[PDB]
Design goal:
The complex is a heterohexamer, with 1 copy of chain A and 5 copies of chain B. Helices cover 43% and strands 12% of the residues of chain A. Chain A is of the alpha+beta class. Chain A has 3 domains: 89 residues, no CATH class; 151 residues, 2-Layer Sandwich (Alpha-Beta Plaits), CATH 3.30.70; 49 residues, no CATH class. Chain B has a single domain, classed as de novo design (two linked rop proteins). Chain B is built from 5 helices and no strands. The radius of gyration of chain B is 14 Å and the shape is elongated. Classes of the chains: A alpha+beta, B mainly alpha. Chains A and B meet through helix 4 of A and helix 4 and helix 5 of B. Chain A binds 3 RNA strands through strand 1, strand 2, helix 5, helix 6 and helix 8. Chain A: Pfam families: RVT_1 (PF00078).
Amino acid sequence: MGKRHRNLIDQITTWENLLDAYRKTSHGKRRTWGYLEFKEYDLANLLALQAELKAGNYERGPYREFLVYEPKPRLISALEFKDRLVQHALCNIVAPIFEAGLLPYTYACRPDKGTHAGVCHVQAELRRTRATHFLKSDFSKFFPSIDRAALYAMIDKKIHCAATRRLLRVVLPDEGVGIPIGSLTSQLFANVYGGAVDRLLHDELKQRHWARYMDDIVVLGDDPEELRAVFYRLRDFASERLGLKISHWQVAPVSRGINFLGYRIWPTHKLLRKSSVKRAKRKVANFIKHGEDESLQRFLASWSGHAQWADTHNLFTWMEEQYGIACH
Amino acid sequence: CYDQMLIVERYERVISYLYPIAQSIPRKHGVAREMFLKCLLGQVELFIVAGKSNQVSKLYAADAGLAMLRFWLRFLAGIQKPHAMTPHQVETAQVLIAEVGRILGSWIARVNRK
Amino acid sequence: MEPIEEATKCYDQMLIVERYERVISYLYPIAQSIPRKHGVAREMFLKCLLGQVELFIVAGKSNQVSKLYAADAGLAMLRFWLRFLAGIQKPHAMTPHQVETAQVLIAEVGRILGSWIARVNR
Amino acid sequence: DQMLIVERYERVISYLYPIAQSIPRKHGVAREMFLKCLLGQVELFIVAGKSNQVSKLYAADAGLAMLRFWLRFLAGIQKPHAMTPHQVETAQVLIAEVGRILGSWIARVNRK
Amino acid sequence: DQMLIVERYERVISYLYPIAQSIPRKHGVAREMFLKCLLGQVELFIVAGKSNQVSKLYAADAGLAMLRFWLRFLAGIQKPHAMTPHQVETAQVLIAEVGRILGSWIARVN
Amino acid sequence: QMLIVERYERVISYLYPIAQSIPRKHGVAREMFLKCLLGQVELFIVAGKSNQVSKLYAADAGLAMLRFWLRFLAGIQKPHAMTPHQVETAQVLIAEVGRILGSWIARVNRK
RNA sequence: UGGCUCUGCCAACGCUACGGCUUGGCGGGCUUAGGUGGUCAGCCGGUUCUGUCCUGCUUCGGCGAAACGGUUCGGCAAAACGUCGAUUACUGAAAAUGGAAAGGCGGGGCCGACUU
RNA sequence: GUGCCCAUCACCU
RNA sequence: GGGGCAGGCUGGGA
């Protein structure tokens, strides 16, 4: 491989790729009005979508914008199955040419790196280096602040294909601040966007012990003054370059626990977030006093996987004391 | 009766394409074949009865037949034993049935709009 | 591109078929495994398994609840065929694991059908 | 009438059944389907003669229309054409004659 | 009553079913359709007797008429002879017997 | 009264090995007997999902048609006759289902 | 898929329009994705009881202070990968859906040890 | 609504 | 006493 990338809409619109995009788009959504209305003439619908992409006549359908409010209110704009399919067709050829350049410590929406690989890299990189302190930051409204202009200085430093560059600009117009949260194309463009601060930590600033998950950035250190300087340098950059205000940040010692990704992470141990605990607690509590104790076993087995890492037992005892049911 | 004659003539292209596919299905998938043939050739009677009357329910039963034909393409594409309707053949057939669905759709609207 | 839109778009018939296609996808391979003898029973099972789709689809493209109970009767008949393939067929046809697995898939289609019947009855 | 229609449909069968029997094995299933449409249409006429309700009189008409499609199918969709365009003309005229009795029958019942 | 017609129609079957088995494989579809019309008309009589609708007794008449068609069709069906003209005459007598019982049954209901 | 089906499931369990034995020779009769034996479940199921005496009478007619099949398959000749023991020992199973059907029809008729 | 409207032979329930049909044997031909969950990007508090733990430097501002996942330890970092160089040079009127490299930064990579 | 990771279920290599 | 972690307990967004 070596730069350029100047004929991607040929691969984007390859039948074997749109079938992958169709499979990807339908994976898990096979109970939904979108798939069931599409599944009817599926291979025919892929043909009028291929011929709409391959012609340069694809127009992204309007987001239906509701607001899920669960952990906090977020304006989640969903997309038609045809549009999520086109995003999947783009992020099959366009994603692995951005996700390749992402430094190894970015653990968001990438294959084989995830929520856990992050909490493990932070714990690990906490044991080695024997970090005395740690800077944790977070970007205010990350998706509703991505410049959608300076983003298209990175999505146009890699795509080079004058047609794919126009399909990315039909999916995400290159106008003003605001990447739609609730879009595959968006998770990618945000990890790429946040990857700018990765290069300013790793390349400039020469910070080698760090981790980013989308907007959350841990930077384990040894002095709490260099880490504060690194943040100031990171904040000044992400503000004057990327238009991202830092909502919360903390240069705490590795003693306060690194609230990273649903785990408070010490060098030695690593609990969970109290919110996840209480959410699951109340979710089970409701499920019991609603009338489901067989799907609870499916959930319990699920959450026993999310908690097998954490040093829990601060819920399973609690559950067993509230209802007596044999958790573990 | 323009739409009934048109819808059949357009459906004849589905038959013209799918009957050779339907005849090639191995006797193993024999029941699936005989049911697919009765669904393919039997859709004509659904169109005929729809034209023979004016009830929009008859044009909906024609839509159900076309939906059942679309299922058969999906099903015969799956059947992984002897194997049948290759994915290309489901693609080409879905295009043909869509034009039959298009004329039936305009037909249903003509009846619903008196 | 507006995906090709069939007339009478019923989510219950689309969902029930997609979920019954899983029953077929499971039962059809083991319907085809029924030996040479027991072929009439297989043909009849296959016409009950594959023919249930048409029951659902005609029920969708109809304003008649009568079609919906006929789909329920067919699902009931499919449940008998599991009892027959296991507990009346000679070699084995359907192992009790397969019966339990199919009874779960058919129950999913039964749950959708029950809600569908209820939604229309109201 | 009720046996007047069948006697004229017998002529359709007497003509089409030899054609149906000439259809090669390859198209055995189409033949069995065609034969069940050809020979089974008698039952449609007969059941309409007994109980005279116009219901099965239109079902007999739909069967005749389905038989007319089969003529188109056997000589236009069956790739080894198992019927000649002449035969789709005389048999159509045979079907047209039984269609005329069916038409008059429909009119006589729907007088009321 | 359904028992009398069936017992008399069992005689039709007992005569026609060996003859219906002898129709050549070439005339296979006509055979299997004639066999499904022979055996199968019992069900028309049985359904007519186990219930009461008149229509059921007419559908039994239609089946009997369809069986009479099959005799006249199988007689001189093609070069592979299906049913000898004597067999049609013999069967038509048996079917006439069940036709007479059906007719009296229809009359007694009406 | 889903005891009918469970009790008829033993009629099947008996009359199926002796309907999956009817040779090719008597193939149409076998296909029709199997559709009458195995298809009687649907008659009972449809009767159970409505309670309409009608569907109950059609289940009675099917059992009567199954009784015809016994009488017909007995006189089918050759080694493939349903043995007279089987015609009695299945008329017993069918009578059990007939007695439940009779009580069922009476329960609905005398509401 | 208990096929074949398919043949040769041989039978024998039978049926024959006397040709055969049928039927039985007997050869031959034809016949990895998936589902369902959950995770996380992805709450704001209030409050003290409990448990624990820290309570120094000082410039006087503040800085503070609270048994392993192969998450292993080293060694390397040539190559490949990534990144910048670069949609640059160059080619060509034009990069026009051609197109580098010398480098620079990396660790993502590599090598063994031990364990997985 | 989005993906990543995970759990279970189905299923044969 | 003040902190820091950890566990409850509760109120709202829901």
